[PDB]
């Protein structure tokens, strides 16, 4: 016998499990349409040069490498989307609003925390210049999360913006921050040239904890206190107010972000990170192109939400359900039965049939074994008088119409 | 810059064309769930042990393979559908309707015809004995063309049992049938140790078109295929099937029916394809036979067709509102409506940077439109905004 299990690392859908995807998948969609927002997709085989140019050599050997001419799977989908709104150019017509939830590939170890294969709700808005786009692309992130059965008290977003810290700086060192002893930053940060009260600008900001802090240093004016205050003002108005928070230790990639970071979390302090985003204006021109062009987007894992949804107790309970089961009374009656089957279809129901014999009662249980709703017994005596027998599993005879 | 093009052979979705995609897997799927069918999926990376046990080490060339230990992107579905069902056991309850809608890699070359990756809708009932799994699968098949506008008139399927040409025989034949000239097989039948007198009965088997010259040749094979048409016609597809003894699309490895879809006027490769296979699981190390129907649904040639015969559609990014502030000063007040349309169930969007009216109402059409929601300070001091549909007003609006 062969390996029944997936190869290390991947998750099998049979129908239970992938009945709870498609559910989560449905909300993203759900969410996506609402939002306006157009679905997109890639292959998941693309160049190795295009991941290469975005993070160096180093990361083909955190990813599934192979040749033709070389190609790898995706470790992540963002570097594929400007690779096609590039090939667009000038065509594409702007504000454009892609989502997509590609698979991607990350060659890593097992049992210890990740698992090599993850879905992923992306969305990003292009060219807006604006803070409008962050607004919109939080409120997003707290919708999907509030369509999961979500609240403000369990979850919450935290808001930074990359432009407090580079402002504070008056070139390479926003890598520094992404790692964290306290102590340790400080060998990291003095080697790049900065006396230690410079180190101290940075050091103590991080752990700054609101905006008016953030103002009392860079001040009221500065264009990224102007923006946190003007992000805060819209996504109040919008109406989730109570879900966002500010807190100057979101560095999660802080280099290959421009403006304003964000990053969804559970409140108790239980998990990762739940989605995290940003503006990165810089995309486009990483992959070489002429014209600098706006962006904002946020990646929304499908593996910390379920464990949050599980804890919380928010994990729906999901069955295969059909219309009908329709029920032969004997082999003779299956061409009746047959198009009775074809006529509950057409009508837009969901019908299944009994496909060796069966005793009636035997055939009662397949309907409730699987999805039942009703059950259509499809007897002569009642056939011959333009008949047919319907039991609900919440006889009665039917023409029916 | 960098190459901006896929890999090569591999399609890009934007938007334009995703719309397309995400329309005929809408017909797989309404017809899955119509038909009672459960999705299923698997990971693309499987053990390449899992594909070399289907088919031989040949494929371990044809193949994407790489080593972490041995894997390889599939080329298939299937030996996931038997990997999955075998981890089950005896807990799977059947019978089990299953399908899913897997993406599939094969290294081939791309200006001579196959293009390295395609989407593929299978479909398997799994525990069946009888000839109403293949009759149903049928069904699905026909039903998921039709959906998408072709009648009987364009399109069809072939019929054809491995039991017409087994039976005949009276072990390893079927192989060479799938290559096709009818001399260039008669060489490749006697050249590995068959008579004269059994190429003429294995040449004139396949040279049938009618299920009345294979009974004139009770049995098993005929006793289905009598039975599978009945039921078919039955169900209201009879217009739809045709029997042909020529269906040897990888015979071997179907143990019942088989089957091919295929557009009528003789254009187009295979549309969809399947058979019975009773062996499938007993072939990845199963003790207990299991028996097992299925097919394959490209999802690249019936789009071809459907564009040929003009049935492909017109699809359309749409949005319900596109919220209109009149200015900067009245966002906070467009953003609060924004909530409410979207939390009402529709779909909105708003304009994001600072613009002109009439700049705004054309990104408006430029988009979907169906309504604009202009939203100034006159009308909502009032308690009242500005709707103008794009088939002013005021209202509050609920």
Redesign the interface.
């Given at each position: 016998?062969?390996?029944?299990?997936?190869?290390?690392g991947?998750?099998?859908?049979?129908?239970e499990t992938?009945?709870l995807?498609?559910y989560l998948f449905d909300v993203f969609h759900s969410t996506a349409?609402?939002?306006?927002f157009?679905?997109?997709?890639?292959?998941?085989?693309?160049?190795e040069?295009?991941y290469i140019?975005k993070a160096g050599e180093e990361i083909t050997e955190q990813m599934?490498?192979?040749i033709?001419?070389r190609?790898a799977?995706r470790p992540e989908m963002t570097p594929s989307l400007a690779?096609?709104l590039?090939?667009?150019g000038r065509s594409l017509?702007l504000?454009a609003?892609?989502y997509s939830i590609p698979?991607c590939?990350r060659?890593e170890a097992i049992t210890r925390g990740r698992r090599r294969?993850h879905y992923q709700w992306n969305m990003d808005?292009i060219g807006?210049?604006?803070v409008?786009?962050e607004?919109?692309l939080v409120?997003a992130a707290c919708?999907a999360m509030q369509s999961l059965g979500l609240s403000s008290k369990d979850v919450g977003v935290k808001i930074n913006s990359r432009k407090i810290l580079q402002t504070v700086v008056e070139d390479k060192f926003a890598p520094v921050c992404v790692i964290v002893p306290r102590e340790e930053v400080v060998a990291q940060l003095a080697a790049i040239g900065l006396e230690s009260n410079v180190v101290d600008a940075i050091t103590s900001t991080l752990s700054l904890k609101t905006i008016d802090e953030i103002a009392q240093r860079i001040g009221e004016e500065h264009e990224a206190v102007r923006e946190l205050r003007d992000f805060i003002?819209?996504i109040?108005?919008?109406?989730f107010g109570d879900w966002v928070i500010f807190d100057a230790s979101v560095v999660r990639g802080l280099a290959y972000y421009t403006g304003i970071v964000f990053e969804g979390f559970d409140r108790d302090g239980n998990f990762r990170a739940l989605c995290g985003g940003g503006r990165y204006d810089n995309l486009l021109t990483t992959?070489?192109?002429?014209t600098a062009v706006p962006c904002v987007g946020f990646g929304f894992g499908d593996c910390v939400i379920v464990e949050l949804l599980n804890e919380k107790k928010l994990l729906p309970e999901l069955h295969?359900v059909?219309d009908d089961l329709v029920i032969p009374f004997d082999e003779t009656m299956?061409?009746?039965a047959?198009?009775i089957?074809?006529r509950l279809?057409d009508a837009?129901?969901?019908?299944?049939?009994v496909?060796?014999?069966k005793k009636v009662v035997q055939a009662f249980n397949y309907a409730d074994?699987?999805?039942a709703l009703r059950a259509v017994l499809v007897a002569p005596d009642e056939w011959a008088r333009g008949e047919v027998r319907v039991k609900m599993l919440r006889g009665i005879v039917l023409p029916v119409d």
């Amino acid at each position: 016998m062969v390996e029944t299990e997936p190869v290390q690392g991947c998750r099998d859908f049979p129908p239970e499990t992938m009945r709870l995807r498609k559910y989560l998948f449905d909300v993203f969609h759900s969410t996506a349409r609402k939002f306006g927002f157009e679905e997109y997709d890639s292959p998941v085989l693309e160049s190795e040069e295009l991941y290469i140019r975005k993070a160096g050599e180093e990361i083909t050997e955190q990813m599934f490498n192979f040749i033709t001419h070389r190609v790898a799977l995706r470790p992540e989908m963002t570097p594929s989307l400007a690779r096609q709104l590039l090939a667009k150019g000038r065509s594409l017509l702007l504000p454009a609003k892609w989502y997509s939830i590609p698979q991607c590939w990350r060659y890593e170890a097992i049992t210890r925390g990740r698992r090599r294969e993850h879905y992923q709700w992306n969305m990003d808005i292009i060219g807006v210049k604006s803070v409008s786009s962050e607004v919109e692309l939080v409120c997003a992130a707290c919708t999907a999360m509030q369509s999961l059965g979500l609240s403000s008290k369990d979850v919450g977003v935290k808001i930074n913006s990359r432009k407090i810290l580079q402002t504070v700086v008056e070139d390479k060192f926003a890598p520094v921050c992404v790692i964290v002893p306290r102590e340790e930053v400080v060998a990291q940060l003095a080697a790049i040239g900065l006396e230690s009260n410079v180190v101290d600008a940075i050091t103590s900001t991080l752990s700054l904890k609101t905006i008016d802090e953030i103002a009392q240093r860079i001040g009221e004016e500065h264009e990224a206190v102007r923006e946190l205050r003007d992000f805060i003002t819209q996504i109040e108005a919008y109406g989730f107010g109570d879900w966002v928070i500010f807190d100057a230790s979101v560095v999660r990639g802080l280099a290959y972000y421009t403006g304003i970071v964000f990053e969804g979390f559970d409140r108790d302090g239980n998990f990762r990170a739940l989605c995290g985003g940003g503006r990165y204006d810089n995309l486009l021109t990483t992959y070489g192109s002429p014209t600098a062009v706006p962006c904002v987007g946020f990646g929304f894992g499908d593996c910390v939400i379920v464990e949050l949804l599980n804890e919380k107790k928010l994990l729906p309970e999901l069955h295969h359900v059909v219309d009908d089961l329709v029920i032969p009374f004997d082999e003779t009656m299956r061409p009746h039965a047959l198009s009775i089957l074809r006529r509950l279809r057409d009508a837009g129901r969901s019908a299944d049939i009994v496909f060796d014999k069966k005793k009636v009662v035997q055939a009662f249980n397949y309907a409730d074994r699987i999805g039942a709703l009703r059950a259509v017994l499809v007897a002569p005596d009642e056939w011959a008088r333009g008949e047919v027998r319907v039991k609900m599993l919440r006889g009665i005879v039917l023409p029916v119409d």
